[PDB]
Amino acid sequence: NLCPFGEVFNATRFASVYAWNRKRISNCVADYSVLYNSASFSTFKCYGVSPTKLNDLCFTNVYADSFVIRGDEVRQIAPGQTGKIADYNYKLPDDFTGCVIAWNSNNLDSKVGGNYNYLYRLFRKSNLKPFERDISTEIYQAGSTPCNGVEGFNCYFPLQSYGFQPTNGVGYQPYRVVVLSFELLHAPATVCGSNSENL
Amino acid sequence: DKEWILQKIYEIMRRLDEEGHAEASMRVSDLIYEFMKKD
Ligand SMILES: *[C@@H]1O[C@H](CO)[C@@H](O)[C@H](O)[C@H]1NC(C)=O
């Protein structure tokens, strides 16, 4: 029983960050040295756990979150961050345990003339809770004008599309991000690294 | 007022993307977020 990380990383269609996709990984063995081997990984930051010790560890449950953002916004996929993405799209807790893996996808998520299939939430009345997912598309009332469910003066569709063009600089180029969460509950560990003592 | 200004900045972003200036439209998007989150 091996963990199917190819379904998450080697997936063809990624989700938008506001509707980020979560995959549960359980009852399997994971060789993180396969992912730690640079299959082109621009970011590989782990928190609460050392990246070289992933293969020696076990965890109660593993969550795999995946989405697409700008290169500018990968920094916000981290504990204690603010910004359009960290506040309105995908929020990591302070006590987060896991890794954040990202890589450039300008060769995949950039169409000549602009790829506008990836969306982000620009407007929200409050910041997100950690791991909260907001997929509501109600018109945002930014002012004192009632919106009545239509777009108008200070009444904006909450989602704005990314302008992914291959001519963009790397900061505006699309980046595919995979966030692996390592849950450590009072329960038997179901996901172990390849070098664990079967514990 | 802040209400009229936000409307014009939102319109600028939309027009910039319609003119193909995608990076400038995404940058104004980033500046709309900072503007509205003054609190
Ligand atoms: C994705 O496929 C490539 C092709 O061989 C492979 O090298 C890589 O390890 C795969 N990644 C995952 C997570 O399965």
Author numbering:
A (entry chain B): 334 to 532
B (entry chain A): 1 to 39
What sentences appear in the manuscript?
The spike protein of the SARS-CoV-2 binds to human angiotensin-converting enzyme 2 (ACE2) through the receptor-binding domain (RBD) and changes the conformation to fuse the viral and cell membranes, mediating viral entry. Here, we used a structure-guided strategy to engineer an inhibitor peptide with mutation-tolerant and potent binding ability against all SARS-CoV-2 variants. We named the peptide CeSPIACE (COVID-19 eliminative Short-Peptide Inhibiting ACE2 binding). For engineering, we determined approximately 2 Å-resolution crystal structures of CeSPIACE or its intermediate-stage peptides complexed with the RBDs of several strains, including WT, Alpha, Delta, BA.2, BA.5, or XBB.1.5.
We engineered mutation-tolerant CeSPIACE based on high-resolution structural information in combination with binding assays. The engineering started by referencing the RBD-binding part of LCB1 as a binding moiety for the ACE2-binding site of the RBD despite its vulnerability to mutations. We identified a 39-mer peptide region that was easily chemically synthesized and modified it to improve structural stability and mutation tolerance. The high-resolution structures identified the roles of the peptide residues and provided information on which residues to modify and how to modify them. Y501 of the RBD is an essential residue after the Omicron strain, but it was N501 in the WT and Delta strains. K417 interacts with D30, but N417 does not, which increases the dissociation rate of strains such as Beta and Omicron.
